[PDB]
Amino acid sequence: PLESQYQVGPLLGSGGFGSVYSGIRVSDNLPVAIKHVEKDRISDWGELPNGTRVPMEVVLLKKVSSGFSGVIRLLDWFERPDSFVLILERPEPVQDLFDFITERGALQEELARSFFWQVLEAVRHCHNCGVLHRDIKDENILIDLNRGELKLIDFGSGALLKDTVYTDFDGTRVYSPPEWIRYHRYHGRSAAVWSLGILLYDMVCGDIPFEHDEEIIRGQVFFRQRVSSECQHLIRWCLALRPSDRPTFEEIQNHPWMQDVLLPQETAEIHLH
Numbered sequence: 001p002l003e004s005q006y007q008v009g010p011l012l013g014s015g016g017f018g019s020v021y022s023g024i025r026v027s028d029n030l031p032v033a034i035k036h037v038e039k040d041r042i043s044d045w046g047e048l049p050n051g052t053r054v055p056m057e058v059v060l061l062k063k064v065s066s067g068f069s070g071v072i073r074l075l076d077w078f079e080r081p082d083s084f085v086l087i088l089e090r091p092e093p094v095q096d097l098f099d100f101i102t103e104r105g106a107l108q109e110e111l112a113r114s115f116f117w118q119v120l121e122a123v124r125h126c127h128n129c130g131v132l133h134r135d136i137k138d139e140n141i142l143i144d145l146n147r148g149e150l151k152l153i154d155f156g157s158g159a160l161l162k163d164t165v166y167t168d169f170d171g172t173r174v175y176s177p178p179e180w181i182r183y184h185r186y187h188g189r190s191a192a193v194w195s196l197g198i199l200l201y202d203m204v205c206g207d208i209p210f211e212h213d214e215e216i217i218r219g220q221v222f223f224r225q226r227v228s229s230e231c232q233h234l235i236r237w238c239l240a241l242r243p244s245d246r247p248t249f250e251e252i253q254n255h256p257w258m259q260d261v262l263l264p265q266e267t268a269e270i271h272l273h
């Protein structure tokens, strides 16, 4: 019922997460994305309500796929003998933040503020549904170029949210917090805030702040680009070396630099049309 119900198109990308293709639902022509994951490469399984043995990503996507938000929704999934196949929303036209930043360089603050806010709403939404993404970064964010709406995408290093320590990590090194580098332990929220700090610097400087472990552990931020006596404060706060010194989501969103965010539509009008 799978190769009948959807019509495959060009490969969107591939890497550690598997292979994703552009697709159309035949039922009606909904653009979709078709994600193939191989059973051999899934380190980490879960189980649905009705109690079947699935990749965690599916658990996590199912928990966050209710209602609207800034998360790309699991429409359906299939099992095959050696692979699981996931069908996801596909905005049209779309561009991931990595390519966007790669093309246009450092982002004007107003646009960064709008993007950053929407990520924060998306991650709040996830933390709310009991899900922790664990790999928030430019290439896990899609931009709907028309609506100016950001969407989070790759839940395959994700985990159920919990208040005790984590001692496994699969996201990107350069995005990992110092407490992971030094101790191989972190807590969810504060590790997410650190990665959000990395993300924001990226947005406003066109590039990530830290390359090597020693830089992360030293946690000292140099700005290669002009950036406001404010955006630099928020960034450094999120990148505090001690987890307990980082802000909560609430504090990030009440920070002066986060005031007067544009709505997504006016964001696209001004900055993407």
Ligand SMILES: NCCNc1ccc(NCCN)c2c1C(=O)c1c(O)ccc(O)c1C2=O
Residues within 6 Å of the ligand: 012, 013, 014, 017, 020, 032, 033, 035, 072, 088, 089, 090, 091, 094, 095, 096, 099, 139, 140, 142, 153, 154
């Ligand atoms: N700029 C081209 C972006 N291509 C992707 C690369 C990796 C990738 N996987 C995770 C990145 N690490 C995805 C995509 C998608 O375009 C995409 C999409 O257009 C709609 C829905 C999607 O889920 C993806 C998606 O998961």
